[PDB]
Amino acid sequence: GRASVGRMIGGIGRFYIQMCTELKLSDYDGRLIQNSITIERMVLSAFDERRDPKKTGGPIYRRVDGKWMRELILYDKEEIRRVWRQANNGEDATAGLTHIMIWHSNLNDATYQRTRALVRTGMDPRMCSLMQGSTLPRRSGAAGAAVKGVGTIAMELIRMIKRGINDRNFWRGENGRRTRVAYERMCNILKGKFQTAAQRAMMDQVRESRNPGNAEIEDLIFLARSALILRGSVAHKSCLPACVYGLAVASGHDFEREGYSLVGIDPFKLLQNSQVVSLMRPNENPAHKSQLVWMACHSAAFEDLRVSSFIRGKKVIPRGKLSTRGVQIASNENVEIMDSNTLELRSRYWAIRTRSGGNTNQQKASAGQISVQPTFSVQRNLPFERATVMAAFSGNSDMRTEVIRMMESAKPEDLSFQGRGVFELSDEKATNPIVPSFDMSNEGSYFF
Amino acid sequence: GRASVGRMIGGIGRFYIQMCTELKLSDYDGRLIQNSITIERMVLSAFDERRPKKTGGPIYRRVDGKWMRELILYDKEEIRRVWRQANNGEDATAGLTHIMIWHSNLNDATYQRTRALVRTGMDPRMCSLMQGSTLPRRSGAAGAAVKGVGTIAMELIRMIKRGINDRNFWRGENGRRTRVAYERMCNILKGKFQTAAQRAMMDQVRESRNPGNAEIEDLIFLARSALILRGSVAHKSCLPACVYGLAVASGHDFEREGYSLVGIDPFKLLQNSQVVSLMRPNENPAHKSQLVWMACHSAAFEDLRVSSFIRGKKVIPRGKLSTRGVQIASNENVEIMDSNTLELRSRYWAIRTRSGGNTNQGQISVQPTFSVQRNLPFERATVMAAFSTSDMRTEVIRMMESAKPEDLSFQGRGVFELSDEKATNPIVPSFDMSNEGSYFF
Amino acid sequence: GRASVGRMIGGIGRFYIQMCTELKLSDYDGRLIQNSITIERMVLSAFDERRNKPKKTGGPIYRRVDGKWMRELILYDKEEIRRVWRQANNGEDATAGLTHIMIWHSNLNDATYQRTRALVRTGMDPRMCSLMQGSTLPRRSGAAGAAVKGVGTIAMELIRMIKRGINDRNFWRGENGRRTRVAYERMCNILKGKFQTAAQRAMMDQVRESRNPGNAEIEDLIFLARSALILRGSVAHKSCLPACVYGLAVASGHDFEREGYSLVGIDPFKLLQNSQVVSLMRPNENPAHKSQLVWMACHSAAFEDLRVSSFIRGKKVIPRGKLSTRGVQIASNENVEIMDSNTLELRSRYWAIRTRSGGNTNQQKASAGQISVQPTFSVQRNLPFERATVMAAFSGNNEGRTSDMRTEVIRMMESAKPEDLSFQGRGVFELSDEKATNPIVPSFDMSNEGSYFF
């Protein structure tokens, strides 16, 4: 794992140094995130083939006297893949391209609330904590599928069921059996992410359906809803802009020899030593730009703010409370009268990125005791699960009711990832897990 | 204004003094709160025209140690002259309103209207929302200010329930007249809520054609929300007429200094008060004093901790007080009652507020990124709400879940010393959150 | 009183002794709990009038022969067993002892098997397991067995009735139907007397008064049962030990009628101290965990707070899932020669009075009290409110059937806290403190959620 990832990370690095010299960019000027994004955007566009002539464009930026200057550079599509293959020791190296895709996906999740897409699908605009990887290209996604969220996969299934209801010739013919394969594979992606048997058993009904319609759509919404409590398995990968990888190899960092893990310490080690610059719009807070980029780098868009705070060693505050817009600068903007700052992407601690959605004791949540019946005449309180006994949803479809029953048993105060904690940046071996304790003065847990 | 409210208070004082001479009440007898209530009730009865041409009630005198009751009767028209004469010729309905609020605040502190709530289909645990529930039909717009969120909700539900029984209730010239009253109240209630979701939910109740159970359920819902996302309610320190009486009798010029119902003035007056009360055997003088103190400052549903901090003496819950009502019943034996000077003084003073407190303000669950030991927060009531104006309701559910009992309100504001008249040096409480008992009822 | 209950205990003891010698069981073989259960099974079979619907009862007897445990299935005449029962009970045919044996099997069942399969078939919540006390009892124990039954147990039976009564039309009419009604109204009354509030009882009136029992009556019953998790029913708890313990007590010259006995007092605890009870162990089972299981059944503590069980027992009482054991009884398909055996540890550090109470369900004061403040002054502070109480109203209770009494039960369930105190001043006792003079009020860890057994 560590060697193959190292090769991949190094490939993007070598590609970034090369492209910078190919665009004649300064050492300092090749450290801007907007430039990094443009180069990242081009490498992805050149390897599309599934979608202006046969060239890819984008805006490149460089410091003149003091103020930054914008010039839209364009290059031949084949020259870009030639530069990518050369940098990746003569190979196609698509796993490197997906890494660039995931970084963009994580950046979008920290920046834009997908509420407009939620209500337009006929879903709850409060399901955005399930929407990781919604802007992922769908193309090149075996590990892209793992990064995708329960809500995301559900939304894309509903889009299919909507399209298959407005036009009859969707499930019939040549492409009819073909689109069935794409539908059935995606259902098993969603079935995969669910941690309870009842959720999977309900997902089997949705999959094994002759011409699915309105009923299946409702089931998906229901399941998506239950994933706010009985959470699904989503993979998280710390994916950084290519400028960080380029500068590292420019410093003589042998990723193949040293080793790299997307879920381990390595991205933190790189970010602690990083020097990333971002353009600043008139009246934007650099302390806030940092947070946005930091959250995206570690895929912490929908993570508990309290936990992100404690790891960062700095207050991670809600998106609505941030004096900043997007990272990318649009065309109509005047990049002339704009200052810039070094982004603050360091952390106090590091932590292992998780593939899990949390601990769900399945049997206890369905049939276990929730109250006691007193036997002896002794002075004491009489334990019962207040919230769970109060709930009457399951009484008001058999697997549906088992899912509800488990949701009623669950409590926000319940604990997950026991014994596992954060580590110091000097604790490379991760022998000393620090169990986090949170601040009392609180900004909340939700970023949106 | 200070001079305006000054005149008003001054008119009550002169009226009380004049009523004592008309009833030949002694200097000591006029200082009894029980006589004050009778005189106040008489001026109220004499002016509420929509109700023989006489009015009275029990009046008490001390002859040779023993308290004697004389149930007096008096000409309504004659009362009206005495009133107008005291108020420099004018009708002065403001003073009549001021006495009503005193009588109201006293009820809010003495009795709990659980019986009335259950008829309405409301939670008896919403009593902290029932300020001014004993106030008359509609007398005073300033009356509506002091009226609580639950009071108006209960008043609106009664209007809807009548319409369910009477077919013509909403129809005709009477129909459009009552409709105006319905919209008027809904808007008052709307002006009391401080969050957009609550106000938009109130827009649907107002604009509703033929309101029914669906609107009642909405109102009950809104009533509940005001237990957390609290509504704006006026709190005005109204004192018994004898207090103003003795002050005017002592040569206090209310028009000179001025007067505010939300400033130091009523506190200042209570500090120098010489109020006396009749005492049933068993009754602890200290507990009658606490009741009257709460009544005067309209602190029935205030935090007992904050009350004790201001009073400078423990303010214990209603169920722990050794006392009944301030008013003595007709079938009660007055001959065996003792009397005491009530302790109405305070250690500190604080500004009376119209605000109900602070309210907060996309996502309702976390998605773990790091493998670390912690709880995974989600909003229980909000998530489950989809298994039951539903958009507006669920938003109101969401905000109630956001707010925690520990959330700070009135930040940067505190009590003042009685010597600090202009309210310049605030003292942020020196006995805060943990355990001490907040609820009076 | 203590004398009559003593007479009952001695009767069962004397019976077991004479059954041991008759069935030719060794002095030590009769100390086996599996052997005691078979003998208990037989005497219950003997007196059950279903005989008038071979005429010999029996079951497996276990003797240790040539090192290994041997199993033989013996039959015996039911009239010969009733004879031994009559001959050991000073000549009476006591029906008190039979019911006492039954409750012991009930309490053993209540600790062994979770009733979650039956509840799901009934349409009830499978988490109502803490109300399933006495569900294995036949409709054969009278008022005494009825007092031991839980709210859920009666409620389930009633639903089964109504469900059968809507599945078949000719269920409530005729001579067959008329007898069903008498049983309907009776169980409705037994359930009613268990509830300790005005609202829960008044709802039971409506269920009973019903002209045609249907889905309305079931849904109300399910509702009442659920409410018995916070506003608990008044279920009687009786310490009922296996016959072998009583048999060995008499065989040692202990006089039960002289020194008295009490099912809810110290006597069963004291008797379990000096007890020598042996059980068969399956391969891979844990001797210590079998003891725990039986001990709970001995003190009807199946659904009791494990913290309370632990403090009384002196050892740590742990949940059902984490136990390395199966049922005490051995199935006939299992090999019994491979079995080991161990003396069950049934001692206790303390003892406490067994209760018929559901706890302090007098929450009528809190139902009308304040649950929030309304600020009068402009002073910096938090503004206290009952979060759990206020938020409890958004639990979807108003969705299904509603009534005035329903809204009062819900109203009282919202006001209750899991941290509410019950049985004030009442505590455990030392074994030497036989007249229960010095109550020891224990300090349970409030940061211990490990309270439930199932």
Side-chain angles (χ1 to χ4, degrees), chain A residues 1-4 6 8-22 25-28 30-40 42 44-48 53 56-59 61 66 68 70 75 78 80-82 84 87-88 90 93-113 115 117-119 121-137 141-160 162 164 170-171 173 176 180 182-184 186-194 196-204 206-207 209 212-217 219-255 259-274 276-288 290-314 316-320 322-324 326-333 338 340-354 356-359 362 364-385 387-396 398-419 421-427 430-440 442 444-448, chain B residues 1-21 23 25-26 28-48 52 54-62 65 67 69 71-84 86-87 89-114 116-118 120-136 139-146 148-160 163-176 178-183 185-203 205-206 208 211-216 218-235 237-255 257-277 279-312 315-323 325-334 336-337 339-353 355-394 397-421 423-424 426-429 431-434 437-441, chain C residues 1-6 8-17 19-21 25-26 28-30 32-48 54 57-60 62-65 67 69 71 74-77 81-82 84-86 88-89 91-92 94-107 109-113 115-116 118-119 122-138 140-156 158-159 161-163 165-166 171-172 174 177 180-181 183-185 187-191 193-208 210 213-237 239-258 260-269 271-275 277-283 285-314 317-321 323-325 327-335 337-339 341-355 357-361 364 366-398 400-410 412-416 418-425 427-429 431-434 436-448 450-454:
Chain A
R2 291 187 64 80
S4 36
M8 170 193 72
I9 288 304
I12 312 152
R14 295 182 295 258
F15 177 76
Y16 195 82
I17 309 163
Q18 186 62 237
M19 287 292 302
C20 278
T21 55
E22 286 272 24
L25 293 158
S26 156
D27 197 3
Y28 178 85
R31 288 196 247 193
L32 187 73
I33 197 160
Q34 284 84 21
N35 292 336
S36 192
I37 282 168
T38 306
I39 296 156
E40 282 149 29
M42 289 155 77
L44 296 174
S45 178
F47 272 100
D48 199 298
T56 185
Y61 305 84
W68 298 88
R70 173 179 59 182
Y75 266 80
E78 268 295 326
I80 307 298
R81 35 197 154 179
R82 180 205 148 270
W84 173 258
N88 285 255
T94 56
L97 305 162
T98 310
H99 189 89
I100 295 168
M101 267 164 44
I102 296 162
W103 147 248
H104 289 150
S105 180
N106 290 344
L107 187 75
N108 267 239
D109 289 346
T111 310
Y112 307 98
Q113 201 173 335
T115 37
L118 278 161
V119 291
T121 324
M123 292 178 72
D124 207 308
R126 291 183 189 95
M127 288 179 178
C128 62
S129 59
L130 309 156
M131 300 310 300
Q132 185 179 288
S134 50
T135 59
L136 273 165
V147 163
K148 280 187 169 191
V150 171
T152 289
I153 301 171
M155 189 174 75
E156 284 156 20
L157 276 167
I158 293 163
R159 288 179 188 173
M160 262 197 277
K162 279 186 185 290
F170 197 84
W171 307 112
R180 178 68 186 184
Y183 173 82
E184 284 194 303
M186 278 208 85
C187 286
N188 282 326
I189 301 290
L190 189 45
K191 188 191 168 179
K193 292 179 187 291
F194 282 130
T196 71
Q199 281 169 328
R200 289 184 166 171
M202 211 181 311
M203 199 63 210
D204 289 327
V206 182
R207 178 163 52 88
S209 166
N214 296 111
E216 273 74 28
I217 297 153
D219 287 347
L220 288 164
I221 296 160
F222 172 86
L223 288 156
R225 178 157 282 115
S226 69
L228 294 163
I229 296 175
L230 303 172
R231 276 162 272 250
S233 282
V234 182
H236 300 81
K237 286 168 170 187
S238 282
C239 307
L240 323 172
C243 62
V244 189
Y245 300 133
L247 189 74
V249 192
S251 297
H253 202 131
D254 190 355
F255 285 113
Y260 201 91
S261 174
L262 270 55
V263 294
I265 187 174
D266 287 305
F268 284 91
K269 275 194 182 290
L270 224 72
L271 276 172
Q272 202 79 353
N273 304 314
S274 81
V276 188
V277 181
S278 170
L279 292 171
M280 299 295 172
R281 298 185 179 95
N283 298 343
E284 277 190 332
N285 201 325
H288 295 158
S290 302
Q291 193 193 305
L292 184 76
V293 178
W294 187 91
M295 287 182 84
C297 281
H298 295 302
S299 190
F302 317 111
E303 172 67 281
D304 184 339
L305 289 176
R306 299 180 300 160
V307 183
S308 295
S309 294
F310 178 82
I311 290 164
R312 180 153 167 74
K314 199 162 292 190
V316 182
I317 67 167
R319 177 67 185 99
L322 289 173
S323 288
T324 173
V327 171
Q328 277 174 295
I329 302 296
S331 63
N332 67 305
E333 288 175 62
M338 285 194 187
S340 62
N341 296 270
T342 307
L343 295 165
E344 159 47 63
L345 311 174
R346 281 146 153 159
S347 298
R348 175 69 180 87
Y349 301 98
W350 69 279
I352 296 157
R353 261 74 75 247
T354 184
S356 180
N359 184 240
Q362 213 173 143
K364 197 201 175 194
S366 283
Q369 246 183 298
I370 48 169
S371 173
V372 289
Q373 185 61 30
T375 299
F376 311 100
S377 187
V378 209
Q379 184 184 316
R380 34 63 183 262
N381 72 314
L382 304 172
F384 62 90
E385 306 295 296
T388 307
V389 183
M390 283 319 296
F393 307 101
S394 51
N396 291 133
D398 188 297
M399 292 291 96
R400 285 183 75 105
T401 53
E402 195 188 324
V403 168
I404 307 285
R405 215 185 285 114
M406 292 184 285
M407 292 166 72
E408 300 172 335
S409 297
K411 295 186 286 169
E413 319 93 56
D414 282 358
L415 234 78
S416 278
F417 314 102
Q418 289 190 3
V422 305
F423 314 99
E424 301 275 7
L425 286 151
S426 55
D427 191 4
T431 333
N432 195 23
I434 314 278
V435 186
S437 35
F438 311 110
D439 293 338
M440 295 302 299
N442 196 46
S445 281
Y446 318 113
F447 184 55
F448 296 97
Chain B
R2 285 197 69 89
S4 153
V5 186
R7 291 160 223 154
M8 191 219 73
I9 292 286
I12 299 156
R14 290 182 301 268
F15 171 77
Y16 187 82
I17 292 165
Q18 199 47 250
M19 282 309 292
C20 288
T21 38
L23 297 163
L25 279 166
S26 191
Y28 180 84
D29 301 346
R31 279 152 46 213
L32 187 78
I33 187 166
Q34 278 75 36
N35 283 336
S36 201
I37 298 158
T38 300
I39 294 177
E40 290 157 354
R41 279 184 69 166
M42 281 166 73
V43 74
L44 286 187
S45 177
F47 276 99
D48 272 83
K54 286 169 176 284
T55 193
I59 276 277
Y60 313 88
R61 267 185 268 264
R62 206 176 212 185
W67 279 99
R69 172 170 48 176
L71 198 82
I72 55 95
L73 299 153
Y74 219 87
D75 196 66
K76 284 190 185 182
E77 191 204 298
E78 174 73 0
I79 306 293
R80 295 200 281 283
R81 269 192 286 269
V82 186
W83 178 254
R84 291 191 185 99
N87 294 265
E90 297 172 313
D91 278 46
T93 48
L96 304 173
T97 304
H98 179 83
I99 294 164
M100 267 154 49
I101 309 165
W102 153 236
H103 285 166
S104 187
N105 293 331
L106 180 63
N107 247 93
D108 289 326
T110 318
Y111 303 109
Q112 204 186 337
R113 279 171 60 94
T114 54
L117 284 154
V118 301
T120 326
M122 297 172 76
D123 205 328
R125 296 167 297 185
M126 292 186 192
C127 68
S128 64
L129 304 161
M130 305 313 291
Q131 173 161 285
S133 64
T134 61
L135 281 174
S139 301
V146 192
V149 177
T151 299
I152 290 153
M154 192 174 75
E155 284 181 13
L156 276 170
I157 296 161
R158 280 174 177 170
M159 260 197 277
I160 301 159
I164 291 156
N165 302 318
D166 192 316
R167 54 180 83 191
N168 296 307
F169 191 81
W170 300 108
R171 320 187 89 88
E173 170 67 12
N174 288 175
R176 62 149 291 269
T178 317
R179 173 72 188 177
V180 167
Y182 177 81
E183 284 180 355
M185 294 218 75
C186 289
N187 282 312
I188 292 304
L189 189 43
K190 179 187 169 175
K192 288 190 175 284
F193 294 126
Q194 295 291 303
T195 60
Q198 282 177 306
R199 287 186 165 206
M201 183 151 179
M202 208 55 217
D203 288 334
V205 172
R206 174 172 48 77
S208 169
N213 291 129
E215 283 69 23
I216 289 171
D218 280 20
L219 283 161
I220 295 160
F221 173 86
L222 284 160
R224 186 167 283 115
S225 78
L227 294 165
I228 297 171
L229 307 159
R230 278 164 273 254
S232 300
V233 197
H235 293 79
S237 278
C238 313
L239 315 175
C242 64
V243 170
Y244 310 135
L246 178 56
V248 176
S250 294
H252 179 104
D253 197 339
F254 283 107
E255 291 127 59
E257 317 286 321
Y259 200 92
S260 165
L261 302 171
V262 300
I264 193 179
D265 304 308
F267 267 102
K268 215 169 182 173
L269 229 58
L270 280 185
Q271 199 69 22
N272 211 26
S273 73
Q274 287 172 232
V275 189
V276 190
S277 187
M279 298 284 176
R280 297 168 177 87
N282 296 4
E283 290 187 324
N284 186 343
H287 296 170
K288 278 262 181 164
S289 302
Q290 186 202 294
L291 172 62
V292 172
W293 186 94
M294 285 178 73
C296 284
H297 292 301
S298 180
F301 318 116
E302 176 60 282
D303 201 326
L304 303 182
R305 303 178 302 166
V306 179
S307 294
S308 309
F309 192 73
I310 290 160
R311 182 161 159 83
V315 180
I316 57 160
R318 180 80 197 95
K320 293 264 171 287
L321 292 172
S322 272
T323 177
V326 183
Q327 275 193 293
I328 301 300
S330 63
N331 78 290
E332 282 170 10
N333 191 289
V334 74
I336 60 170
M337 306 253 179
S339 63
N340 289 266
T341 307
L342 303 162
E343 233 314 320
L344 298 184
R345 286 184 291 189
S346 273
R347 182 156 135 273
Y348 289 109
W349 83 275
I351 303 166
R352 261 81 69 250
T353 203
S355 185
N358 203 345
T359 54
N360 57 73
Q361 288 296 292
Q363 182 191 4
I364 47 160
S365 185
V366 295
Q367 189 74 38
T369 295
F370 307 97
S371 178
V372 190
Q373 183 171 307
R374 34 68 177 261
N375 70 306
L376 304 164
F378 67 89
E379 307 298 278
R380 193 200 284 105
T382 310
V383 174
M384 304 309 296
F387 304 113
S388 74
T389 62
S390 67
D391 295 40
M392 298 155 184
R393 289 171 89 108
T394 187
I397 309 278
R398 205 205 79 248
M399 285 174 179
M400 291 167 75
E401 271 204 295
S402 291
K404 309 297 173 197
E406 310 93 46
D407 288 338
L408 231 65
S409 290
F410 307 106
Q411 311 86 10
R413 280 156 182 168
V415 300
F416 312 93
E417 301 281 18
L418 286 166
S419 66
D420 185 35
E421 285 167 21
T424 316
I427 314 289
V428 178
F431 175 53
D432 321 340
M433 202 197 312
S434 175
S438 281
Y439 314 122
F440 184 62
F441 289 100
Chain C
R2 287 186 60 80
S4 62
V5 177
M8 179 199 71
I9 292 296
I12 300 171
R14 287 186 294 273
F15 167 79
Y16 190 82
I17 297 168
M19 278 303 296
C20 277
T21 55
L25 304 164
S26 161
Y28 167 80
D29 289 349
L32 193 81
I33 194 168
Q34 283 78 29
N35 283 335
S36 187
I37 281 164
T38 301
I39 300 170
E40 286 157 4
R41 262 263 211 166
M42 280 162 60
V43 70
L44 292 173
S45 200
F47 282 98
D48 180 14
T57 184
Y62 305 91
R63 317 171 202 267
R64 205 165 199 174
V65 170
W69 285 103
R71 180 214 287 159
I74 57 155
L75 299 170
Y76 228 55
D77 278 288
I81 295 156
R82 291 192 299 275
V84 181
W85 185 261
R86 280 173 184 87
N89 283 286
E92 189 173 35
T95 49
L98 302 168
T99 307
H100 183 83
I101 291 156
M102 273 168 55
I103 298 161
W104 147 245
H105 292 159
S106 178
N107 294 352
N109 274 297
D110 297 346
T112 309
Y113 316 106
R115 285 264 69 187
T116 72
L119 287 162
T122 305
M124 290 168 74
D125 199 298
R127 299 169 293 197
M128 292 179 185
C129 49
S130 88
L131 312 158
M132 294 324 286
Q133 177 151 304
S135 44
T136 47
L137 282 174
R140 206 171 75 213
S141 52
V148 163
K149 287 176 173 199
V151 168
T153 292
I154 304 179
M156 189 169 82
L158 283 167
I159 294 158
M161 291 250 291
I162 300 160
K163 282 203 171 191
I166 60 172
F171 193 85
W172 293 106
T180 321
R181 176 132 212 84
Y184 184 81
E185 295 190 46
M187 263 151 51
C188 284
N189 291 322
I190 308 160
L191 192 59
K194 291 181 175 294
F195 297 119
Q196 302 298 134
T197 56
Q200 282 172 315
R201 283 175 156 175
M203 211 167 309
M204 208 59 217
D205 280 340
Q206 297 170 50
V207 179
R208 176 173 50 86
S210 175
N215 293 125
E217 285 65 69
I218 292 165
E219 278 157 14
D220 296 347
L221 280 163
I222 286 173
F223 169 79
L224 289 165
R226 179 163 265 263
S227 79
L229 297 160
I230 296 174
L231 310 168
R232 276 161 270 249
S234 223
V235 187
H237 296 272
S239 278
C240 307
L241 317 176
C244 65
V245 181
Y246 303 134
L248 204 88
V250 186
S252 298
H254 174 77
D255 203 297
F256 279 113
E257 189 186 352
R258 177 205 186 85
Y261 202 90
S262 190
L263 262 48
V264 295
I266 183 171
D267 309 73
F269 281 92
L271 215 69
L272 286 183
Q273 290 292 121
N274 318 315
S275 77
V277 202
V278 179
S279 176
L280 293 171
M281 301 293 163
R282 298 176 180 85
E285 279 186 333
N286 178 7
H289 292 163
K290 275 258 191 185
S291 295
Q292 203 212 256
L293 168 62
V294 178
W295 184 86
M296 306 182 80
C298 277
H299 294 306
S300 198
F303 316 110
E304 172 67 283
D305 193 347
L306 305 172
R307 303 184 294 158
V308 175
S309 287
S310 292
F311 194 96
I312 286 171
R313 187 164 145 80
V317 182
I318 63 160
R320 185 67 180 87
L323 287 182
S324 302
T325 187
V328 170
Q329 272 168 299
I330 306 303
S332 53
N333 72 294
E334 300 181 57
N335 188 61
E337 286 163 36
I338 50 165
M339 299 276 175
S341 72
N342 278 283
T343 302
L344 297 174
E345 178 64 23
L346 301 172
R347 265 97 76 166
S348 301
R349 173 98 151 96
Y350 296 110
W351 72 279
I353 306 168
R354 259 82 66 246
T355 193
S357 180
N360 192 109
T361 55
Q364 270 81 346
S367 299
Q370 274 188 257
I371 58 175
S372 184
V373 292
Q374 189 74 225
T376 300
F377 308 94
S378 180
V379 195
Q380 187 194 300
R381 30 64 194 272
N382 65 319
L383 290 169
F385 60 89
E386 298 294 294
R387 170 168 163 85
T389 309
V390 174
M391 300 317 295
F394 313 112
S395 308
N397 294 299
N398 296 130
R401 277 183 55 92
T402 64
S403 60
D404 277 19
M405 296 302 167
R406 266 173 176 254
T407 46
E408 207 193 327
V409 177
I410 291 300
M412 289 175 69
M413 286 162 67
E414 295 170 359
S415 282
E419 324 92 41
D420 289 342
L421 232 72
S422 275
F423 302 89
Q424 290 196 56
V428 302
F429 306 101
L431 286 158
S432 56
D433 196 28
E434 280 138 66
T437 326
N438 184 48
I440 313 290
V441 185
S443 169
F444 299 95
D445 196 331
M446 287 302 152
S447 65
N448 190 5
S451 281
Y452 318 115
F453 181 68
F454 287 99

